[PDB]
Design a protein around this ligand. Structure first.
Ligand SMILES: CCCCCCCCOCCOCCOCCOCCO
Ligand SMILES: CCCCCCCCOCCOCCOCCOCCO
Ligand SMILES: CCCCCCCCOCCOCCOCCOCCO
Ligand SMILES: CCCCCCCCOCCOCCOCCOCCO
Ligand SMILES: CCCCCCCCOCCOCCOCCOCCO
Ligand SMILES: CCCCCCCCOCCOCCOCCOCCO
Ligand SMILES: CCCCCCCCOCCOCCOCCOCCO
Ligand SMILES: *SCC1=CC(C)(C)N(O)C1(C)C
Ligand SMILES: [Mg+2]
Ligand SMILES: [Mg+2]
Ligand SMILES: [Mg+2]
Ligand SMILES: [Mg+2]
Length: 549
């Protein structure tokens, strides 16, 4: 419903963000009965998730054809820690119980957040405003079991505590336990503070043990015209496979300001980040200490039928030095309800620890660089909200291994051309939400398709209510995809064919406190893989409930 904060770090109406923008709320996730973050994300425009099996296995996110490491995943506005040792976001381990909102903005945004924000940004928000206590649970195929307790209460005027415990367990598997607490205090009606803690202990079967904890603390000012935020953040994760141990601590501090001016806004902040890893983390001998500080400017202005939006950033990285990025967007509502939008942006990706200092390291690498153009038409027609975008993304200085000298070097190039189309509309009691993605992602030097990516995807959601039963059908076509066959050397490129997949979900309020839900995932039990060799789930049944007071 209308607001985002992820585009410039502060609240604005979505109609005011010129980049394509998806919002997923807790209500959606409960209806969809998602038992992981991937299942939430896989439903959205330009998202191509591949996974080495069912839930908990290593996964990669390809937003609009870009590399796994070319999406910025934020947790409550701060770069996901799990992402820091390898330089590529993998959310298979992150607990769905913590996801209260997802804001997903496509197109570049390094001009606000710095490194990784190339294909787009996915911000997972863990805060809810929803007082009262809840107990939920579920049971499903592969002996899935879930138990969950949460409460949000007032501790008098001005203060609130939120607490959550979640236990999720499956067999052949993947066990996950999660604890979250938060305190929110309002000093005046304009001034706020918060302290927020959470941690999860996961186990995945070769046997993996991931633990992570995050602590965030901040001050906010929310005036009639001025807005300010000061947030400090600390993450500690530890990742065992067995005796290999990857450990990282990530510290972040960021001060941002924004003022309403005219019909629009101007903003600015400063951003600092430190990452220390343990000796032997990322198959690198020594422990490292990496630092980054960035300063940026945002702006938004509406003049008559035109909207202009922009951001500009400079980052100083302890390893590669200085890199600047920028982006600008103009939109023209040429007739009421219809709008052309043109965007241009630059973005980048920092080298990772392995590329820099691993056995094959090159300590002098520069960032990977993206330039993107996009053009869109959006409209409201006869009750249909729609949008169609075409984009071009030239990526250069890709960090590639050279076999001859056994070192990483900047040299590869990629060209992505894509089309995004979306629509939502109702027909009597039925709500339809539909998207189509075309992605022609290639190596620009050799002109061959990049690997692991569906060239086409079609995604359709159908929701309705009949007798207090709330039903959701979800359909997805996963198009043809090229991959390597690793069972035989030299590794040949294989073609994986298109697949249709259907899910069926329902919910019923037994009483005003008690809702029961059931789901059949992959209803037609289709055999398929998103990584060659790795078998996905098959038809699965889940059954759950929630008791509120
Ligand atoms: C390739 C050319 C690069 C040129 C960069 C120019 C930067 C823009 O300068 C003009 C800024 O003017 C608009 C300011 O926006 C702030 C919004 O508030 C203004 C209220 O109407
Ligand atoms: C006082 C300037 C505040 C905004 C600067 C951030 C945007 C930097 O890139 C913009 C350069 O491209 C041309 C911009 O012209 C249109 C105005 O940009 C929208 C901000 O109102
Ligand atoms: C606040 C808005 C900032 C927008 C600025 C974007 C415009 C960038 O234009 C200059 C790009 O840099 C050119 C570098 O110089 C040419 C490279 O060749 C020199 C050899 O070292
Ligand atoms: C108030 C913060 C505004 C600072 C952000 C501006 C950075 C935008 O950089 C755009 C990239 O421009 C390319 C050229 O940058 C190279 C630096 O040149 C320095 C000496 O020429
Ligand atoms: C790719 C962008 C193309 C957008 C095409 C839209 C062109 C004009 O849109 C329709 C103009 O409005 C007519 C709407 O239908 C008649 C309703 O008239 C008002 C009701 O009294
Ligand atoms: C203005 C909205 C974009 C329209 C997209 C669909 C129309 C296709 O028209 C011709 C396509 O030309 C072939 C190239 O297709 C992929 C290009 O994607 C856009 C990047 O340049
Ligand atoms: C879609 C092209 C014509 C103008 C926009 C119509 C509204 C689109 O919304 C529905 C999107 O549904 C998927 C349609 O897929 C066909 C369009 O693909 C463009 C291929 O170049
Ligand atoms: S979208 C920015 C955002 C994330 C969260 C920390 C939940 N917030 O307080 C803001 C609005 C800074
Ligand atoms: Mg077990
Ligand atoms: Mg058991
Ligand atoms: Mg250099
Ligand atoms: Mg009652």
């Amino acid at each position: 419903d209308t607001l985002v904060c992820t585009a410039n770090r502060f609240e604005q109406p979505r109609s005011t963000v010129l980049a394509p923008t998806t919002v997923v709320t807790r209500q959606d996730i409960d209806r969809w009965q998602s038992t992981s973050v991937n299942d939430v994300l896989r439903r959205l425009p330009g998202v191509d998730i591949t996974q080495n099996g069912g839930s908990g296995q290593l996964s990669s996110i390809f937003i609009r054809g870009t590399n796994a490491s070319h999406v910025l995943v934020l947790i409550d506005g701060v770069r996901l820690n799990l992402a820091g040792v390898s330089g590529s976001a993998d959310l298979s381990q992150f607990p769905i119980a913590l996801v209260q909102r997802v804001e997903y903005i496509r197109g570049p945004r390094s001009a606000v957040y710095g490194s990784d924000a190339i294909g787009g940004v996915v911000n997972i928000i863990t805060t809810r405003d929803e007082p009262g206590t809840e107990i939920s649970a579920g049971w499903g195929s592969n002996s899935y079991q879930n138990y969950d307790v949460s409460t949000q209460q007032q501790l008098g005027d001005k203060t609130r505590v939120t607490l959550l415990g979640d236990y999720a367990h499956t067999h052949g598997g993947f066990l996950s336990k999660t604890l979250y607490g938060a305190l929110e205090h309002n000093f005046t009606d304009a001034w706020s503070g918060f302290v927020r803690g959470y941690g999860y202990d996961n186990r995945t079967n070769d046997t993996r043990k991931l633990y992570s904890q995050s602590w965030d603390a901040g001050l906010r000012y929310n005036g009639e015209l001025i807005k300010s935020q000061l947030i400090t953040s600390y993450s500690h994760s530890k990742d065992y496979n067995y005796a290999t141990l990857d450990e990282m601590k990530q510290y972040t501090v960021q001060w941002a300001n924004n003022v309403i001016v005219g019909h629009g806004s101007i903003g600015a902040g400063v951003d600092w980040q430190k990452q220390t890893t343990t000796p032997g983390t990322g198959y690198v001998e020594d422990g490292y200490d990496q630092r980054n500080t960035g300063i940026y400017l945002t702006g938004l202005q509406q003049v008559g039928d035109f909207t202009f939006e922009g951001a500009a950033r400079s980052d100083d990285n302890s390893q590669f030095g200085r890199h600047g990025t920028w982006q600008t967007s103009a939109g023209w509502e040429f007739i009421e309800g219809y709008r052309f939008i043109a965007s241009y942006g630059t973005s980048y990706k920092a080298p990772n620890l392995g590329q820099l200092y691993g056995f094959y390291g090159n300590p002098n690498l520069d960032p990977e660089k993206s330039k993107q153009w996009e053009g869109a038409f959006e409209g409201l027609t006869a009750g249909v909200n729609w949008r169609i975008s075409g984009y071009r993304n030239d990526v250069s200085d890709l960090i590639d291994y050279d076999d001859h000298t056994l070192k990483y070097y900047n040299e590869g190039k990629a060209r992505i051309k894509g089309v995004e189309a979306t629509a939502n509309f109702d027909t009597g009691p039925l709500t339809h939400t539909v998207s189509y993605d075309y992605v022609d992602a290639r190596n620009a030097i050799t002109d061959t398709p990049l690997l692991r990516r569906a060239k086409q995807q079609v995604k359709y959601q159908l929701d309705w209510q009949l007798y207090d039963f709330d039903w959701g059908i979800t359909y997805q076509y996963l198009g043809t995809r090229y991959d390597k066959d690793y069972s035989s050397y030299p590794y040949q490129t294989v073609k994986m064919g298109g697949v249709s997949l259907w899910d069926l979900a329902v919910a019923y309020p037994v009483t005003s406190h008690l809702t029961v839900r059931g789901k059949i995932a992959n209803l037609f039990d289709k055999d398929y893989e998103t990584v060659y060799g790795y078998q996905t789930a098959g038809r699965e049944y889940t059954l759950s409930g929630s008791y509120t007071f």
